[PDB]
Symmetry: D2
Subunit: 497 residues, 4 copies
């Protein structure tokens, strides 16, 4: 059965990144189902530590640890066993009374806090990976468009000449700082609240550093109230999602205006556009609009979370709003989709050059030139060139046909004085590619300037990937160390007692 | 004329920190008036740099720089001269045509972006100072209450025994991470977008590193689009305010429940409470409620800013919502007020000890004890002690009068079996101060454990102050260097030409 | 298998209304799956109208209408057939080319707009029903507590004596105005945008009034742009949910403070409370806190929707945020839960009377009495009674033991003058039940005053139910008329051609 | 001194409506200063009623009422006398002890609640007036553009031909429903909570209907808790502002795209555009962007208010966020500005007709035609016409040059079959003005259809104005009745005692 939406101008298949936008909603787990595997890790690491502290005998420990494996498999099909007390009770039906001892010196409060942190931890690494993939597409694309002269806009009005590479490296710098936000957040998420128990700790001599290490954390949430009452990292995760997607919305909006029937300076790749069920001519920006809709929706969780924190005391509370899997799934899908839009975007280079040359974005260089040559102040030069534009529009003269006669009229009509400049000066000022070549300082659109910041982004991307790799490898190490300690106890009990 | 609100039980004056809450609203500047002094700094630093680059002659430079001083003084009483173009025009009326040359290679876009950053920069240091003052009061107060036994709550129900020092050190840990957020933000605020001009730079050979250094920045916003289109730091500043104040709201809510007529475990200092104009008995928590109202209002700017970013392209845009002075003024007033509430809070130690001993917060230790002594699993022990509570309530027995007979009944009625524990074990378990002494791991309420994290917070506060001092001193250095360079040009022109 | 959470003090089963809070999240449909049955109604009504307009022959119509039945059944298990174009294509595989003609003069834009309206329509009636059930429990409960003297609070400080019936009738008045909001909204939701097609109508001679009537609408969205671009009713639905649940959060917070270990003026019914997995004494207000969490989350959709509307033009747009089934499901569950909390709430009448008599909420009547008897101004009387309270607290005198000596001291110590009142006046003023009986104006807690507004709420509830019944019956009528017209065409084609 | 921003292409003065956007921020009152005149009305009406109830002697009443006049004048320059207790104390310094008796049976709680309602009441009428002025400009403008053929957009892609009048009447229908929202809100704002006193009424025999009538209310907030705890009308006022401005943002965004350098289908009037301080060619849409920024900011108050309601009990609370004067002032300025933008907008009719004829918005009529003539299903016809567009773009054929050869190619290349239609059918289908004339059902762009809904909007606007007039006149009547009753008492005391 074919894809019934790939009709008319929607040729080929949806790009896989484009399809994500339609799939994540119905495939998203509940928070309960997504956190549940991490709770089971906590059960194992907590029991291991209880064993190493002499609170559980090695017999008791091995019986429990083997029960968790059995119950974990039951809960794969029985959703009711995914909250703690149903889980504990089913473990008691599987190995008996000893099951209850896995909760010594522990609570649902610090269990839930740790499990949700572990879930948000992986989803944070999942996000950093996607945001790195987003930046790479952006930077790779910039490197191919150092010569693609085009206008930049301000207030949705043509401003000055630049290049597509210049524009894309603004997104790279936006994404670099969003990656810092995410890494900063990670340091506060990857703290372990286990050992806080209900909110006040326990008399049982737990080793909180041990449970924290086995579960992949880089440190502890020290104070026990903060361990269960702390939620600011949930609000911050929601925020960074919101702020990052707002920049993604702006790019998607920028590209959507580029690809209007009236601009026609860019065209979406067919694999990222849909059609209309009624209007055959439509090549619709469904990818851009559905991506932005995910950006708008990220406002919701952030507001919900902060409202819930403003409404309570500094306590554990069941009234606090969560950051849900479906919210992150939406962020990932949009990020993947815009990664694809950017990689496959088709710039219409000739109409780009045309707008830059004809629609008066070069007037600033005409103004600056009068100031460089005849030495008038900028406000006066600006007033003359304004008259030039006003007159040229009235007379239908495109910017690149503006000449000496017209510049002389405006100076006269505005100051009574002529102005001492040559036809060649005007010609230089009105050449959009020279507008680019002259803007060669740090962060400006000249090729050697944009290439320089691309090289910097290359070096920064290598560090981004390195940070991601070390963080991913660290969690894998602790996960492997935990699985070893678990088999160690199960085999020790099997052989020596 | 006396303060007509200090009547009835509202004895003495309002605490000055309490009065701030009523004064900041009517005293708050507009964004235009608050940013305007920083724009004038930018005019000076930008002109200095234009001079050092040979774009302005030293004569032109000195004439401009002297004009800014004159116009700055005019604008102290003429509000209309506080936006750029009115300012430029009044400088032209004061020194003539040369005034226009101060805008060479510059725009209102990067001017405004830099000026607002400078304003938010100082207000960020102002906030860190207040948040440090908030943490100091919290930690100083904790150090005096290592022995103040009291219950901690979860879900607004008495949970386990702790101390006031333990509770306050949860706030200290919350504030430490909010200080990290603010310092992380500072690094992104203290970047200079000047040199971006409209959005694309300029042909004029500016030294952007020079203007950035003279104005106190630690680096550049490199890409020129990001220089004018970047706003994520405004949204992040709004967020950290929102999240930090949400924790402040929770403490104020915690203290407000403490000081209810029904709890009576704490009392606000008279200088932080008001009365009722109708009900003479009221000692009202106006300080707490008005502080929380500031926390709720901080939701607004954050949402407004992110909405505006979701609604535009990646451009300079006049449609973006600002972070207003009055919003920060509200944060500061609430922070100062809660600094005062915490310092002067009166804990009712005896009723604190009473609740801890009588209202069953010690039952967990009774449960843990059965598990330590007779070795039953925790779920079974928990079921027995639950029956103990149910029966003791039915019979009006306070927790600390629970004895061997009752524990034996419940075990029998629940398991058919007696339970092998002594009267002295039960007595230990039910002593609320021993509940505290036994919770002696990291982050737990035992005095030696709370004293340990106080010492850590002492060391962290010293670093907080050091970071603040270095950051404040750096801006003062650059401000002094700028003022010197300005006088240098004015005196060079006066003597040699 | 028993409910593993019903342990300790959590005796019996969860109340069914309480269980809803834990079930709705995993059971909630996607917007696609919830709107899909209504789209199929639209297909039928649209085709019927096309037939009555002579755009489809009766043969074509019957073939289509029979295909929809077949495809509807396929889509019950094939989720992919629940968006339009997959559905149309599968109808074409089932009856052939004629399938395409069901889309004549129609678009996905006005189809989706109408289908979502129909979904929100039923969910709005579902909400009004639940909110009526909420008000009935509130009013029924008030009628049983005209004598339950208790203090009302302001700023979480005891204010004046009232009764539980008085308090509950404030909620009834809050709910009456929320029912008006919902009915006002309904009139704007129940308008039909079908006939707008893409956004501009069509040349095909549709009868829009006909399609609107067959689908249960009370009128048209007239202008065709408004038909597809209109979304304000989605934002308003989100808002009323948010504002109504905020009042529900406040009641749940009110009851949660009532049921603290320190207040003890009310107790949740065991079927609406949980326990702790660690602390056996806990009787936790899970119902209240989880209900409030739904109130906080309703902030999200509202903000998401309005953000999306602020970010677009006045057009159809795929970027607009929806009101999702899971959001409404949360509202319903919380409303049902608080309906149960209110019905089964256990007021502790004796401790209610005790607080009212001892904790100084009667001082206003003491103040008013001095003004009635000796004729001093209220500010002076208020200052005397304030001194009375201050002294009585210092000396440990409960309010109801305040006598003539004390009142005379305070007047002397404050004015130098005695005060001409009798021991019996003071005794009257300090009797909390007389405080109630004297507050007998409109809306005040005296029994005859509260009974009067209960009778009014009875009459209003009868009208609420009548409006609901007429609105439900109207949709059922149109649904039946539609099903008849569909069978009419299928049988006409079967017999005569 | 001239307006230094009216330079370059910013010719003439700012339109006064445009200037409002820059003035309201610095001119906005605090909530305290804006509510204060209404509090003084309440003092008068409350005292009058106390007199009519025999609680005050006519001597006492006249002394008070004359004092309020004196103190009102003092508070015009002394801001400290604008909150209640400072005001009462200064009235006591002016007429003596009797001043205190004006507060009998009253509180700051119901005083503040009523005063803020009165303030929001007038500001609501102020808003309805502005929104009516907005709709009139929209409808007046539509009536002049029944022939202005232009494309409508969906997803920012050209959709189908319409007219400017058709588009504007979508805004009129949006505004009609926003006027209903505002009138619905008004009925809940114009209820009087006075008589509730602290929260529970009073023993003093007040006539609440009397005070309510003298102050212009149409009814009472009956229950006394609801009288002081009720805030839902504040949240609803914030919402309707937010939702209405979101529609205003969308129009401003629509017009801003119209007026891009690339669309050029509309141009802002010079009096509603600014220029750039650097780029002389800029004709910037400052009016549109600053209007949208007001729409985004209206998100803030709404969120702040609902957060504060979610964070408290159902009580009077000083923690509730207000709707501030500056928020409404922003709404009014934007509404006035867009009223001016719409009235003075310059449509470029020829380029409008050009886009409609050349850029393929007529393809739906080409598709519908194949279905009408040869009877193929819509999906097949749609696939053929899609191929037509794809081929015509490839070959550079504008829509209106599409002919029989091309249509025949596509049918063949897509179905193998030719298609039985004439050159004249195709020509009809591709004529954009006939696309309009054929869309002649309810709400469609045909002139006789748009003229019909203009006549309806005319009739609705007359009713809008009538409702506004009756509501304004009613408040003026009660204000005059109050002023009479006040002079009555002052003159009665002067003559007879």
């Amino acid at each position: 059965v074919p894809d019934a939406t790939r009709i008319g101008r929607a040729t080929g298949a949806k790009a896989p990144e484009f399809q994500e936008l339609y799939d994540f909603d119905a495939a998203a787990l509940t928070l309960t189902s997504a956190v549940f595997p991490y709770d089971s890790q906590i059960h194992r690491a907590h029991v291991v530590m209880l064993t190493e502290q002499g609170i559980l005998t090695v017999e008791e420990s091995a019986t429990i640890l083997s029960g968790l494996a059995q119950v974990d498999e039951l809960a794969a099909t029985d959703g009711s066993l995914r909250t703690y007390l149903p889980y504990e009770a089913a473990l008691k039906r599987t190995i008996g009374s000893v099951a209850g001892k896995m909760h010594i010196g522990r609570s649902r409060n610090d269990l839930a806090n740790a499990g949700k942190r572990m879930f948000l931890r992986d989803q944070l690494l999942r996000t950093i990976e996607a945001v790195i993939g987003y930046r790479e597409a952006v930077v790779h694309k910039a490197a191919d468009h150092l010569d693609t002269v085009m206008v930049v806009y301000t207030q949705r009005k043509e401003a000055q000449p630049i290049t597509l590479g210049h524009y894309l490296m603004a997104i790279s710098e936006n994404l670099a700082k969003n990656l810092d936000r995410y890494r900063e957040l990670y340091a506060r998420i990857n703290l372990c609240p286990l050992g806080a128990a209900a909110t006040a700790g326990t008399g049982w001599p737990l080793n909180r550093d041990r449970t924290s290490a086995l579960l992949g954390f880089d440190g502890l949430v020290v104070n026990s109230i903060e361990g269960v009452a702390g939620w600011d990292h949930v609000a911050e995760h929601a925020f960074v999602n919101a702020v990052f997607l707002s920049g993604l919305s702006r790019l998607a909006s920028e590209i959507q205006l580029w690809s209007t029937d009236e601009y026609q300076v860019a065209e979406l790749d067919a694999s990222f556009a849909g059609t209309s069920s009624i209007m055959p001519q439509k090549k619709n920006p469904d990818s851009l609009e559905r991506s932005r809709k995910a950006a708008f929706a990220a406002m919701g969780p952030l507001v919900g979370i902060l409202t819930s924190l403003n409404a309570i005391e500094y306590q554990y509370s069941a009234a606090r709003v969560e950051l849900e899997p479906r919210s992150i799934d939406a962020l990932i899908a949009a990020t993947h989709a815009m990664t694809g839009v950017v990689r496959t975007l088709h710039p219409n280079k000739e109409r780009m050059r045309q707008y830059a040359a004809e629609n008066y974005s070069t007037m600033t260089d005409l103004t600056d030139m009068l100031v460089r040559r005849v030495g008038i102040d900028y406000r006066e030069a600006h007033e003359i060139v304004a008259h030039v534009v006003i007159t040229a529009i009235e007379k239908g003269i495109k910017a690149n046909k503006i000449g000496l006669d017209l510049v002389q009229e405006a100076a006269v009509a505005q100051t009574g004085a002529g102005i001492n400049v040559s036809a060649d000066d005007i010609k230089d000022a009105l050449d959009p590619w020279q507008n680019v070549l002259r803007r060669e300082g740090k962060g400006m659109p000249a090729p050697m300037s944009v290439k320089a910041s691309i090289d910097d982004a290359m070096a920064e991307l290598h560090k981004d990937r390195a940070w991601l790799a070390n963080a991913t490898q660290a969690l894998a190490n602790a996960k492997q160390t935990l699985a070893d300690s678990v088999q160690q106890i199960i085999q020790t009990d099997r052989k020596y007692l």
